[PDB]
Ligand binder design. Structure first.
Ligand SMILES: CC(=O)N[C@H]1[C@H](O[C@H]2[C@H](O[C@H](C)C(=O)O)[C@@H](NC(C)=O)[C@@H]3OC[C@H]2O3)O[C@H](CO)[C@@H](O)[C@@H]1O
Length: 386
């Protein structure tokens, strides 16, 4: 029962991810609120690219009166709860002054929670082996995004008043908090010196960001693309295209976990993540397709499947890069580089979805990152050595 703790706490650090991301865009795209500004909510998670600049300051000192007299997952999760609940309670489309009143605060709190959830509890009490112990968290997180996001809006759409859905989420945090009660000045810079001390620091830096650049386009404006001027025709039916792909990706990752051990060809990443582009064509093939009966359901279960499989492979390679004394203090840096592409991709993608429509944005712009996989082949000269 040692691992049973992680999953429950996973939902604490997996829920707030979608409330400023896909569900905020679905909530704005259900109203008119233009088209460009729906994607202008991508700089909200700017806190997920500066999280390493203050990763060590939060911990270490933790004076008892300020913090540590109760676990810090509480000192982040309770504060997060008020901000999330107040986010939706404000004006839906009349006065949008909340664009930053509760978007930046939510991202700040989440980025402050995932850091303390990877530092003070992950490697301090892992019981040595961290492979399966950490593989359980990915599942206690994927499932948190499944609870929110697509399936979450299924009841919100039927129910009258989107603020009620927020009360569901603020109420889904109550079990977290209750199951958790029973579950340095120079610190900022001294770590960073070991990341650029390699030959291949800049090459790995570029590879980390450009590899997933393609995978971010296909999850940037899917919510608006389907319901808006497209054969989806609904919003209630959103489970068809916003839930199936989460269960498909979680399952794909689970297959990836056993398969990686089953790896018989050293390619690993190359083959497991090369097809991430041919899977995105599922959307393009539906771009010229009428609403149909099941058409959009063919791609939802296949595209999110391919990237889902490659998820574990990415994270696992990202973990091996940094397992030294500095520990997760430096891991968080590689987790700031992974979200840079998907945080800033919105406005740029939208500008391209304005001039040349949707289709050619799915064909060329999406496949821009397939060459990056080709570049990974060169990067396999130094990666193979280790
Ligand atoms: C260990 C961990 O929590 N990593 C990050 C998490 O990524 C997860 C990521 O989920 C993505 C967003 C998703 O599938 O929607 C998944 N993929 C990668 C590459 O990180 C995987 O799931 C747990 C962790 O790793 O998300 C945020 C990144 O900005 C951050 O809160 C957090 O650093």
């Amino acid at each position: 029962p040692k691992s049973a703790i992680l999953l429950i706490l996973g939902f604490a650090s997996g829920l707030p991810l979608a409330l400023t991301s896909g569900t905020l865009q679905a909530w704005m795209t259900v109203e008119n609120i233009d088209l460009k500004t729906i994607g202008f909510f991508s700089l909200v998670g700017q806190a997920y690219v500066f999280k390493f600049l203050w990763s060590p300051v939060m911990d270490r000192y933790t004076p008892p009166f300020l913090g540590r007299r109760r676990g810090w997952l509480v000192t982040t999760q309770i504060l997060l709860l008020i901000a999330i609940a107040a986010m939706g309670f404000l004006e839906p489309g009349t006065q949008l002054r909340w664009m930053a009143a509760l978007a930046v605060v939510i991202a700040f709190c989440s980025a402050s929670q995932d850091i303390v959830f990877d530092a003070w509890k992950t490697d301090v009490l892992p019981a040595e082996e961290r492979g399966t112990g950490a593989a359980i968290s990915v599942l206690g997180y994927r499932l948190g995004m499944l609870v929110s996001g697509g399936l979450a809006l299924w009841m919100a759409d039927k129910w009258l008043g989107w603020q009620g859905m927020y009360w569901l989420m603020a109420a889904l945090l109550v079990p977290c908090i209750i199951a958790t009660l029973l579950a340095l000045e120079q610190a900022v810079v001294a770590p960073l010196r070991d990341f650029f001390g390699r030959n291949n620091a800049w090459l790995i830096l570029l590879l980390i960001v450009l590899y997933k650049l393609g995978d971010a386009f296909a999850m940037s404006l899917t919510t608006t693309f389907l319901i808006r001027g497209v054969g989806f025709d609904a919003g209630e039916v959103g489970m068809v295209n916003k839930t199936l792909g989460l269960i498909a990706t979680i399952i794909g990752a689970l297959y990836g976990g056993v398969l990686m051990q089953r790896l018989s060809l050293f390619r690993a990443l190359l083959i497991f993540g090369i097809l991430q582009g041919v899977s995105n064509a599922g959307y393009w093939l539906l771009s010229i397709t009428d609403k149909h009966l099941m058409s959009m359901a063919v791609a939802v279960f296949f595209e999110n499947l391919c990237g889902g499989m490659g998820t574990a492979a990415f994270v696992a390679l990202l973990m091996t890069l940094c397992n030294k004394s500095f520990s997760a203090t430096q891991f968080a840096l590689l987790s700031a580089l992974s979200a840079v592409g998907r945080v800033y991709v919105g406005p740029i993608a939208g500008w391209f979805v304005e001039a040349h429509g949707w289709p050619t944005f799915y064909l060329f712009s999406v496949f821009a990152a397939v060459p990056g996989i080709l570049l990974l082949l060169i990067c396999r000269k130094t990666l193979e050595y280790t």
